[PDB]
Amino acid sequence: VQPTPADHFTFGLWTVGWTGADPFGVATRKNLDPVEAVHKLAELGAYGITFHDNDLIPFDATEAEREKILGDFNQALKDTGLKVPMVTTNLFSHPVFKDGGFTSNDRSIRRFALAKVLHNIDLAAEMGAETFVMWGGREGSEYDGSKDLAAALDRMREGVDTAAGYIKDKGYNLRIALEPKPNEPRGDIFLPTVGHGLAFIEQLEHGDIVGLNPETGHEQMAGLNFTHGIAQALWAEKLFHIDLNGQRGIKYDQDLVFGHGDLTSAFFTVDLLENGFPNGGPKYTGPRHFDYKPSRTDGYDGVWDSAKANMSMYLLLKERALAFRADPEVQEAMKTSGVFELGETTLNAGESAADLMNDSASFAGFDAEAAAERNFAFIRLNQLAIEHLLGSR
Amino acid sequence: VQPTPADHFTFGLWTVGWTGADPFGVATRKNLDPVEAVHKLAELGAYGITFHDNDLIPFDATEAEREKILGDFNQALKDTGLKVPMVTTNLFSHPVFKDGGFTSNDRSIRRFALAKVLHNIDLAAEMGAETFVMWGGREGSEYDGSKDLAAALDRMREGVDTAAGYIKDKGYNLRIALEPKPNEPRGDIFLPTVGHGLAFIEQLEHGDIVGLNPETGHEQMAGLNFTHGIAQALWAEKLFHIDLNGQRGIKYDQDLVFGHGDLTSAFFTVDLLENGFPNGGPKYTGPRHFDYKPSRTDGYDGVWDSAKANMSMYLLLKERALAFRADPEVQEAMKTSGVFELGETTLNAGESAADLMNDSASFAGFDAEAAAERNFAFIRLNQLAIEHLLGSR
Amino acid sequence: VQPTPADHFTFGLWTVGWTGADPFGVATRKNLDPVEAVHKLAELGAYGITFHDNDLIPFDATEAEREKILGDFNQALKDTGLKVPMVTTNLFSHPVFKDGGFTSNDRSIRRFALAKVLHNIDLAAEMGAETFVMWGGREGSEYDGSKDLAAALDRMREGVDTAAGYIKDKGYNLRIALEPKPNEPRGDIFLPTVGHGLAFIEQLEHGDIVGLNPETGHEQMAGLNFTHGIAQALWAEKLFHIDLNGQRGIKYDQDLVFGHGDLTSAFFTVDLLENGFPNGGPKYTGPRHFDYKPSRTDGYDGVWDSAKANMSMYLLLKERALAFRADPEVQEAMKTSGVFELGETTLNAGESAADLMNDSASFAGFDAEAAAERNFAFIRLNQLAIEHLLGSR
Amino acid sequence: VQPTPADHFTFGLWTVGWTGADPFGVATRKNLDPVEAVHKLAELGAYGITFHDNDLIPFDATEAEREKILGDFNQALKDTGLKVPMVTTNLFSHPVFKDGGFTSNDRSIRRFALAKVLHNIDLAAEMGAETFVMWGGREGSEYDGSKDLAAALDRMREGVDTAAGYIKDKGYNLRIALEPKPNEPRGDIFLPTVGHGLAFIEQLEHGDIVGLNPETGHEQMAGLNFTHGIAQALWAEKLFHIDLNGQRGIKYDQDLVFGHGDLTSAFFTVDLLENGFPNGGPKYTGPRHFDYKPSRTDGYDGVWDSAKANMSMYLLLKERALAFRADPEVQEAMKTSGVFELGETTLNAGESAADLMNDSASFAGFDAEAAAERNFAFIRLNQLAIEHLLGSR
Ligand SMILES: [Mg+2]
Ligand SMILES: [Mg+2]
Ligand SMILES: [Mg+2]
Ligand SMILES: [Mg+2]
């Protein structure tokens, strides 16, 4: 419960560097120098750091300034050994992206935004990032009439497929991860959840290198079960990255420490990333990225406390989830409840639809009332998970 | 604002026949005979009626009883001319489906449930239904540990692909529509929204004849924009059916009359079904199905009032949405706001990613501050839509 | 973690007795005989039992049937030693109550509902109940014009003042507890949250013996912090009873076991009930009542299992919350965050507004930016708390 | 639909002046000079203007700067005739207020916050404001152990009683209006809803001149019915001010124009404000204040457009709500649904509880099932209302 680099905890530069400006107030902390960020995270046990183009390099920066910033940064990474596993672009802060990057009603802003992305892919390759995240935060509307809904999706597809074709063309070993979000900053964002995101990728021409980057808080903002949406992404072989934080209900994006929102949910999230599926199946072996914000009420000691907290929470949940699954009481409760039974195909090997229709024991002579008497024992099984969680077993 | 059969208003037998039992009380109305339902709906201007297998035919019914019920029903349809455009199966009422049909932890219940579906497909063909709806209402969990998340999806796929292969095999001209729902009756349902549903179909073997059946209320239960989710379904060419009702917020499934929930949203929903996309694209020309419930406080006069209300609301919204789009002030407001501009591809014909990166006017020499000065005028445009809605223009 | 009568765990007859019918399906369990409920609950460690008049005595019961049923139930209580601390009135399942009891639009119904309550006060008094709970579940509307909102609150007051007047008159030592609920079964219910119930009580003629019965899931259905709510009820000394359960978000009411919802909020509710306020103040001493429903997926072993899960959940939280406040590291963290500092009055002993305004050091020469440097360290206090919750420290 | 000063449309300086910075981006508009705001608003038909102390006078303003600024603003008011009906205090943007003003854990900060309020009361009185608004935006927490909840309410009371005491002492005719808000910017805010604010007021020493300022979007953020909320405030005669805007669901605060959110609820709020209660009762006569923000996508033409949209929205709703209640068909529908019947007291003139209980016809021989046959016809009353809303009848 001391993190180490094979744990693969990655942190975004914008998280610990978030100085505290919210919509009702100014920053409460001084800016965090990025070299200092790299040194402080390496020391806490982080494996890597991620950033947005404008997190390191100002929008305004001249070529010389860009060279100077990147040199110090590269030096810092070298001194520490921190990797840079994911890179992303800021397509939401400057006033020009008031109506989006890629789905901006203005065509000249869509070309600028797509060029901001291609340049960033080149920097992403250079850094040795394996994933390029795309968070379309300003793509949407506040009013139903603001957009042509089909055009938005065509413009979004265009953007994404041009970027993907460009990776392919240059031979970069980079994958694109789209990060779905319900709302905020727009009152409605395009591809609001994990399924919209997932569905969207199947319409792309270069879909093969496009996957997702779900975020705890984002699904929770539409009241979805985070464990069930990552399950589906994994199931489809599209869980390319993951962002973990906490959220307490449907409200503004809180960005708390992982485990400080919905704890029981955090627990089962960690059981799926760590243990996978009960009957076997896919596993996610990428980085465990923390995309959160150190509460504005706290000074810099709280920033480093908060960074430590993320990794601690994940490790506490991991031991509890490993003991839980190892527990023989839990394994037999799982058996009773039919967890392993769900793993069995419904049809017998070689059985056809006509075969089952016509099988008298599966329908005509099936006793539905007897079958309804089964005690699934889901509460008891729920109860065992929580007793494991509470460290009482 | 007198409905007629080319309007294609279809009503489910369970809507007007809903006698009023909620989780806190008993029915407040007497049962509605299904022949009387057909006669009363034909007379109100409905085009068709839909039903769940157990809405017409009791679970218990002997073959003779099934023959007798279907004969009277068929007679009624013949006497009136009402079609039966969609059929669906009850996989959620009997105690046997306490943990689902298709994703039931018990394998014997999954075989029964799939056989209940194949038999129903045969009845669906017989009735001349073009769509077979599948609402997986009991597929999910209340506890994160109740299921093996990957197995659930494999079991769901198995069910759905067996049913689809069986349509194909028998040569029925029937399509399957899955209806996504966030929650209720389960605390979390599998394929909770339109994207999960959409994503899910791309993993199926018989995906080609599988599409969606979104419902106003269902998306609204996860706080999504209904117009933007049907837009995406349409965009993907998967909007096979549609269910319209009203819902006032994130809470239990209310099932109000279309236009009695979120009115402005209802309005833009009707603008998309009726007018389509501003720059052109797909159109939805299937039935406009009302899946709602006549409030339990009201007697039978309210049931028929409520049925009339659905069609009235849709026709009032339709005229307001046609005037709105015809309005030359509105067309020029759309132009200013860049609604048509979104229709233009981002890249020039023949332009490549390298071409745009390297185009100095799109990036390097792009004036982002000048571009940020643009007045999108989205509020004014929103305001014009509402003045059209209020019948003030 | 073995409950004893000393713990004051009370259960509603309706909870273990809930047979499984929900809006989409029939009962999955057989009716529970009340004598068995009493016997079962006494073997688990329950302190008492509570009921609604129609949980015990059927709506259409003859006089002979009523006495048999009470002879049976009084015998059971006598045999087992269980107490009956609370009694409530079912003003919701019979179709007569579709528009409410007390705020029904029909005056004849308001008279019957209130008659039904007065008779029930006699019964409650006879049983030795100390609390009389009023849950106005059908009090509200689906539509904004259905009700005259000032007249609904006048009617509500009349009902509550008549019942309280009657208690005072008859010399019964009963206190009325109003149970606020935002929705379900009505689309909007009168006196939606703790706040609303408390405000209403202050408009009552006999508000001195009228307080609240907050329920965990009801407040979570509005997105409110359950703990902030009962704190406010406590502070006004109006916390007369409490109903504990689980709710996983804004959706239908789940009625999960306590701690099977929002764990961390459950942990903080236990802390408040057990440890009181950090700086002292009123404490809650009534029954810890569980109003939940055994999931319908579970048979009768599941029912006694979930009844036991309420009590184990609570005892495990209590143990952690006691360990939490006793930790010296936590006591120190609390001092550091200003938790005890909030207890010191803002003004000085006999300081006036005018004295405060001209004091130079409090305003005029107050260094606002120096003050703003304080690291409140709330993340670290939060992290310690979860660490005590997880049985880690 | 041309507003006139007689309409009492008031606007906050912060609303038209909002420059566009949100959590994900910088300002998209230039600062608005306050003199121009005053002039612009008087040309649109505004009756008055309201501000926060720091909207006008910068936090670090010298004495010389403060007088210049007030000379400029007083001149503008004089020139245009605008009134200043409400003044409020910014106890939220400066980093000193990260934990609150009045309920900050730091005692030195509580003293400065209250000093800052007292000084602002003098200013408000000087300006001729009738209402003093208190919005405790930083009063709350992200974490359940950050605060002693009884001590936070004691501190809050001290602050409000000190300010009210001061008003009384100085002979100013100002009334305090507390503005409840459930969240944002804190994860949970003290006095979350109308209900909570009203309950708190009754625990105050000087609660007689302390009332509420409900805001439309704040209540919709909890899923509450805005109309039920102000009705309850009205009924207790505590509706001192109102803030009108739009909110599309439980998500961040949108601050859309009034009627650009939930239309039908907007329609029913106008009806209540204009027509009062169907059976009579208190009526609201203060300013109709708009606290919204011009979407950041819109330039300055958009700003004056949205200021005008507030007033047109309201005037269009008012016209429909007046037409609605005057319709004979609607008056009849209301009688039929029992709307006036709710106004008749339940008991008879000098009827006691005891008299009611033994009356055979009210209980004992009351035919509950005959009573339950009444068709309340709420769907048809709702349908008439939407038809008047849509300018259809
Ligand atoms: Mg993220
Ligand atoms: Mg449906
Ligand atoms: Mg309760
Ligand atoms: Mg406000």
Side-chain angles (χ1 to χ4, degrees), chain A residues 14 179 213 215 218 243 289 291:
Chain A
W14 61 100
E179 175 181 339
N213 184 55
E215 157 172 328
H218 289 189
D243 289 352
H289 186 253
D291 180 3

Side-chain angles (χ1 to χ4, degrees), chain C residues 14 133 135 179 213-215 218 243 245 255 289 291:
Chain C
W14 71 84
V133 155
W135 177 56
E179 188 186 326
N213 179 53
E215 166 179 315
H218 286 192
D243 282 6
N245 57 9
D255 282 319
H289 181 254
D291 182 3

Side-chain angles (χ1 to χ4, degrees), chain A residues 261-266 268 382-383 386 389, chain B residues 142-144, chain C residues 216-217 220 244-249 251 254-267 310 313 317 389:
Chain A
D262 183 5
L263 188 55
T264 304
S265 193
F268 285 94
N382 192 48
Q383 185 46 215
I386 304 184
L389 176 54
Chain B
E142 299 58 68
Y143 317 100
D144 298 338
Chain C
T216 313
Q220 294 185 170
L244 294 168
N245 57 9
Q247 180 71 24
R248 292 173 77 194
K251 54 176 91 174
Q254 294 202 283
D255 282 319
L256 317 162
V257 167
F258 174 76
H260 289 198
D262 184 346
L263 199 42
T264 306
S265 165
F267 175 65
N310 284 296
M313 284 302 316
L317 298 164
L389 178 57

Side-chain angles (χ1 to χ4, degrees), chain B residues 364-383:
Chain B
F366 183 67
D367 177 7
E369 324 303 301
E373 295 143 14
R374 184 163 180 179
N375 180 28
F376 283 104
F378 291 139
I379 305 147
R380 186 167 170 275
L381 180 75
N382 192 48
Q383 185 46 215

Side-chain angles (χ1 to χ4, degrees), chain C residues 100-129 131-142:
Chain C
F102 281 8
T103 78
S104 189
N105 273 0
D106 178 302
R107 193 187 175 254
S108 72
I109 299 164
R110 309 192 278 291
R111 298 176 64 74
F112 176 69
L114 180 64
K116 204 189 190 253
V117 163
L118 300 163
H119 280 112
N120 211 43
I121 295 180
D122 294 331
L123 176 56
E126 219 178 284
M127 297 282 161
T131 306
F132 197 79
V133 155
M134 287 183 204
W135 177 56
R138 293 280 177 193
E139 312 323 312
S141 58
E142 291 54 75

